[PDB]
Amino acid sequence: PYEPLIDWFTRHEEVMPLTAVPEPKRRFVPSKNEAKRVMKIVRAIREGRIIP
Amino acid sequence: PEYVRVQRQKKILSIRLKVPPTIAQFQYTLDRNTAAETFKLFNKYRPETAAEKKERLTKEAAAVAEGKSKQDASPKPYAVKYGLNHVVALIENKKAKLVLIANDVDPIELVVFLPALCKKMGVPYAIVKGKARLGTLVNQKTSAVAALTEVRAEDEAALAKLVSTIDANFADKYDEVKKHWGGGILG
Amino acid sequence: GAYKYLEELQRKKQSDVLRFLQRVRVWEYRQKNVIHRAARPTRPDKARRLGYKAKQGFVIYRVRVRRRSLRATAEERVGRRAANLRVLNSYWVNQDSTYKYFEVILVDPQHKAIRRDARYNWICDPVHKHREARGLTATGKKSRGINKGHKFNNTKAGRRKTWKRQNTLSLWRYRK
Amino acid sequence: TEVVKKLEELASRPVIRKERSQSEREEEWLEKLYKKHGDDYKKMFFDKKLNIYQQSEGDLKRRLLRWKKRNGI
Amino acid sequence: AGVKAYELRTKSKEQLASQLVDLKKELAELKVQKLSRPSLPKIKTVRKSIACVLTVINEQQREAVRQLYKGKKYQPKDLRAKKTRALRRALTKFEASQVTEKQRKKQIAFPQRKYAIKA
Amino acid sequence: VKVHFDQAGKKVSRRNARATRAAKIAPRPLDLLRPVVRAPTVKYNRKVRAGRGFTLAEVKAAGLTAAYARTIGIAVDHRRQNRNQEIFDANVQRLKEYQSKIIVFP
RNA sequence: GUUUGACCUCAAAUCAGGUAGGAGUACCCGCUGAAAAGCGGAGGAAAAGAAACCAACCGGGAUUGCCUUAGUAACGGCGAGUGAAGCGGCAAAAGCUCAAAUUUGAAAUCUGGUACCUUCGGUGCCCGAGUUGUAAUUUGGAGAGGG
């Protein structure tokens, strides 16, 4: 037959995350890979392959 | 045609049969004005396009090319978050202040844990109607998920009242009928 | 990530939601052809652990077979149909009393993403022509039964091989 | 032994190596830090402006010592 | 008493086509002469001349097509290399020399060294 | 039925391989540096033997990494386990002697 | 708003670019199979191949092949006879890649078109593909974050 769903496990709420994963450095500082792409464009403009 | 015949015969065979209650939580979704204000919120937090990204990159790169190293200062980018594994990743920290969930995904099973997962994690989820409308606010075709974490101080008070609005409109209205087996009525 | 959710939910097949989706989708696929192209993997996590990537050069076919094995024959059908494609792998999705359904990942060695990107360029080699025809796939190696273990002995084709060991005689220049 | 000695000299021969230098922007950045804070590291570690990547305490020392050996004693 | 190849390289295409018309008329005359003749050596020369004229004309046309298709990243298939089955296929050098970035970093970090034992 | 008529020939070809490979590998030996390893199986447990590769921990005890040691021509087996003391020590002395006799070009 | 638009699906293209077939087939790999034939699929080899292994030892260490194990173990109207494998010695030796937790301070990824260029390609620009996940990093022998 059919019957409504039991929510035994949802009703207890986790006050904490699952994983104790340490926070990375790059989440706090300006993005590095952005800056590498910036310096790529800088090298292309120094070679004049990209016009300002 | 065949495909018109099947796409009309689809959603008949669904509603004719008993749907499990972990489905039909979908289409018990957000009403008109609240979804409207949610979109007004998230269009304030559109992510940067590839063109706008590359444009700012060319600006700062021409700056360094002159050099003319102007300063080293930028607060953070704030935007919506839209990668599905990234959306789940922002939960289980928790970081998701609001989550929008599209009702229509063809592999529904990608999505079905997310209401219960934000339920147990206490994240204010809301089921939105249409992943195309998610993709529009995130410069994709579809997105099917929409997480939002970081908000400016100008918008933070609007955020909290939107959360209270959703928890009044969604968590109070549809919670018991979420448990019930939907559909089953023939066509 | 969300793939662990999909896998653990996938292990509970006769649970109500999965049999609901299964029962809808078997009728829905019954509307369509024996063989057709699926837009996306219905079980993406299973496709990932079989090696799917979401880029150009990855084609997903959905194939219907009547109840060799059924899975290997399902691979042979789409191998015969899309000859330009190379069959990566395949997996079960759904079944009926009349038919089982399989979802097969094929890879094109003609697309430049596949011809570059050295994780997958090995499949452009002409020794990888029709791996399902020689049973070089995963289900092919299982039905050939090729592993390490004393449980694995001389079986069928290898049996003829060791029959070959009994059939041929080896002689040296100086007789031993 | 003889050709062994010749190859032993060749492997014993130091190659003409180049010192790994510094890039102009980041040594200029170090030069800004050298005039802003001086030499002390706990102040420049908790500096927001011109330490936005929040460099490690001693990476700062390593780069400054390399910069000083390169230029400015 | 025959044509030369290099003499035809200098000529314009209308000169070559008119030369062709001349040789075909000469052939048509030599057939009428040869139906009386048991052995006429001149027709064997002039058919080789017609062949060389066609060679130079086709060569100039093909090289003109190559020059107009020079810049493009494509070619008509007949103008491409012939080599064989599957040397058309399955790899270029660039598509074979291509390696992942991780193994690139590994070979940079630890290349295969040169050493000599017993020293 | 098969007769090894090529037994004389293949050896020649094999030494051609042992010539030709050696041509490419001109200073280096053809073979890697293999461990000296005592055999199983009580019929053979007094016998010592050439082994496949040493281990990670032994190469660390030699004072280098296995990723670098493969570039030096030292065969390394991860799935072996060092359980005897004298085997370990003798193979460490072997590694040290191999380190003493090599000269490496930059 | 009876309008307009996102998608999604499905069609159509004398649209662009590619690719499949057939022959041969000594060797290889699958399928079928009598008293071998046949079928299908490749290559210069193919297959197999880096242990859910073998062992019981003072343990060994991807696969492959040779000698030995050995006409032994085992099987068999235990009749006809069938018929291995561990170890050892040798040849050859080589190891690697994914899939699981976020780059979220910026999809960082790629096909294609075009313009040039030093063209088995490169650069630029633009369409697209892609978050229902393309890159970097990590495959337990750990590894990652930091310091």
For chain E, the domains span 1-73, 74-119
What is the distance between the alpha carbons of residues E30 and E45, in angstroms, rounded to a whole number?
Answer: 11
CATH architecture of the domain with residue range C1-176: 3-Layer(aba) Sandwich (3.40)
C176 inside 8 A of chain F by CB? no
Chain F window 13-72: residues with CB closer than 7 Å to nucleic chain G are: 14, 17-18, 21, 30-32, 34-35, 37-47, 49-53, 56, 66-67, 70
D65 inside 8 A of chain F by CB? no
Q: Which residues contact B9 (CB under 8 A, 6 or more apart)?
A: C31
Strand G contact with F2 (CB < 7 A): no
Please list every residue in chain D whose beta carbon sits closer than 8 Å to the beta carbon of residue E116. 4, 7, 11
Stated in angstroms, how far is F2 CA from G88 C1'?
Answer: 26
Distance from chain centroid for Cα B158: 17
What is the distance between the alpha carbons of residues A6 and C138, in angstroms, rounded to a whole number?
Answer: 40
What is the distance between the alpha carbons of residues E30 and B135, in angstroms, rounded to a whole number?
Answer: 81
Stated in angstroms, how far is B182 CA from G37 C1'?
Answer: 62
Comparing every residue's Cα with the C1' atom of nucleotide G101, the nearest one is C1
Q: Which of F28, F68, F102 sits opposite E110 (nearest CB)?
A: F68
How far is residue D37 from each of residues D25, D62, F65, measured CA to CA in Å? 18, 16, 42
CB-facing half-sphere around the CA of F98: CA atoms within 13 A: 23
Question: Which CATH number is E74-119 given?
Answer: 6.10.250.3450
Cβ-based burial of E107 (10 A; exposed 0-12, middle 13-18, buried ≥19) = exposed
Q: Are F64 and F95 in contact (CB under 8 A)?
A: no
Q: Report the side by side order of strands in the sheet with B98-102.
A: B125-128, B98-102, B145-148
Q: Report how this structure was experimentally obtained.
A: cryo-EM
SS3 C169: coil
D16 inside 8 A of chain E by CB? no
Tell the residue number behind the tokens 């050099």, with chain if given.
B67
Q: Are B148 and B160 in contact (CB under 8 A)?
A: no
SS3 E111: coil
Q: Are F102 and E117 a contacting pair at CB < 8 A?
A: yes
Q: What angle do the packed helices B2-9 and C16-31 form, to 10 degrees?
A: 160
Preceding amide of B94 cis, omega within 30: yes
Q: Are F35 and F51 in contact (CB under 8 A)?
A: yes
* Closest-CA residue of chain F to E113: F71
For domain B1-187, give its CATH number from 3.30.1330.30, 1.10.3720.10, 3.40.50.300, 3.90.180.10.
3.30.1330.30
Beta strands in chain E (DSSP E): 114-116
Burial D43-70 (b: 16+ CB within 10 A, else e): ebeebeebbbbebeeeebeebbebbeee
What is the distance between the alpha carbons of residues E31 and E24, in angstroms, rounded to a whole number?
Answer: 11
Q: Provide the token pair at F81.
A: 């386990």
Q: What is the resolution of this structure in A?
A: 4.6
What is the distance between the alpha carbons of residues D34 and C76, in angstroms, rounded to a whole number?
Answer: 70
Cβ-based burial of F92 (10 A; exposed 0-12, middle 13-18, buried ≥19) = middle
Name residue C133's amino acid: A
The H or E element spanning position D9 is helix D2-12
Tell the residue number behind the tokens 């109840």, with chain if given.
C67
Q: Which of B22, B65, B180 sits opposite A42 (nearest CB)?
A: B65
Distance from chain centroid for Cα C173: 47
What is the distance between the alpha carbons of residues B121 and B115, in angstroms, rounded to a whole number?
Answer: 10
